[PDB]
Copies of this chain bind each other. A is one copy, B any other.
Amino acid sequence: KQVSWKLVTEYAMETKCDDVLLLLGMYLEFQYSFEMCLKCIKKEQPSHYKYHEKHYANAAIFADSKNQKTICQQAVDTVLAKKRVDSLQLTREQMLTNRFNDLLDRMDIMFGSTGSADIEEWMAGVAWLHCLLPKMDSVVYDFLKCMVYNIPKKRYWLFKGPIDSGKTTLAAALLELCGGKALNVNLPLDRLNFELGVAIDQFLVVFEDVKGTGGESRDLPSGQGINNLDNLRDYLDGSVKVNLEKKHLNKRTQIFPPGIVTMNEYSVPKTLQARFVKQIDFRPKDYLKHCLERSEFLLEKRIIQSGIALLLMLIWYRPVAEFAQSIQSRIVEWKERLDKEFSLSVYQKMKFNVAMGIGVLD
In A70-112, the 8 Å CB interface with B consists of 70, 73-74, 76-78, 80-85, 88-89
Alpha-carbon distance between A197 and B245 when the two chains are bound, in angstroms:
12
Q: Judge whether A84 and B25 touch: CB under 8 Å.
A: yes
User: What residues of B have a CB within 8 angstroms of the CB of A89 in the complex?
Assistant: 44-45
Asked whether A240 and B188 contact (CB < 8 A) given A21-B80, A84-B19, A164-B274, the answer is: no
Q: Judge whether B152 and A302 touch: CB under 8 Å.
A: yes
Smallest CB-CB separation from A189: which chain B residue? B188
Q: Judge whether A77 and B81 touch: CB under 8 Å.
A: no
Alpha-carbon distance between A199 and B70 when the two chains are bound, in angstroms:
25
In A230-257, the 8 Å CB interface with B consists of 230-235, 237, 239-243, 245-253
Alpha-carbon distance between A82 and B44 when the two chains are bound, in angstroms:
16
**Interface flag for A35 (CB, 8 Å):** no
Q: Judge whether A252 and B168 touch: CB under 8 Å.
A: no
Residue of A168, A181, A240, A253 most packed against chain B (CB within 10 A): A240
Q: Judge whether A234 and B250 touch: CB under 8 Å.
A: no
Q: Judge whether A300 and B149 touch: CB under 8 Å.
A: yes
User: What residues of B have a CB within 8 angstroms of the CB of A329 in the complex?
Assistant: none
CB distance from A140 to the nearest CB of B (A): 18
Q: Judge whether A187 and B231 touch: CB under 8 Å.
A: yes
Q: Judge whether A20 and B187 touch: CB under 8 Å.
A: no
Stretch at the interface among A130-138, A204-212, A330-338: A204-212
Stretch at the interface among A120-128, A217-225, A309-317, A342-350: A217-225
Q: Judge whether B219 and A269 touch: CB under 8 Å.
A: yes
Alpha-carbon distance between A85 and B23 when the two chains are bound, in angstroms:
9
Alpha-carbon distance between A223 and B224 when the two chains are bound, in angstroms:
12
**Interface flag for A42 (CB, 8 Å):** no
Asked whether A22 and B85 contact (CB < 8 A) given A168-B237, A240-B175, the answer is: yes
Q: Judge whether A77 and B163 touch: CB under 8 Å.
A: no
User: What residues of B have a CB within 8 angstroms of the CB of A279 in the complex?
Assistant: none
Q: Judge whether B64 and A6 touch: CB under 8 Å.
A: yes
**Interface flag for A24 (CB, 8 Å):** yes
CB distance from A285 to the nearest CB of B (A): 16
Residues on A facing B (Cβ under 8 Å): 5-6, 18-22, 24-26, 28-29, 44-45, 63-64, 66, 68-70, 73-74, 76-78, 80-85, 88-89, 149, 151-154, 163-164, 168-169, 171-172, 175-176, 181-184, 186-195, 197-198, 206, 208-209, 211, 219-221, 223, 227, 230-235, 237, 239-243, 245-253, 264, 269-271, 274, 296, 299-300, 302, 305
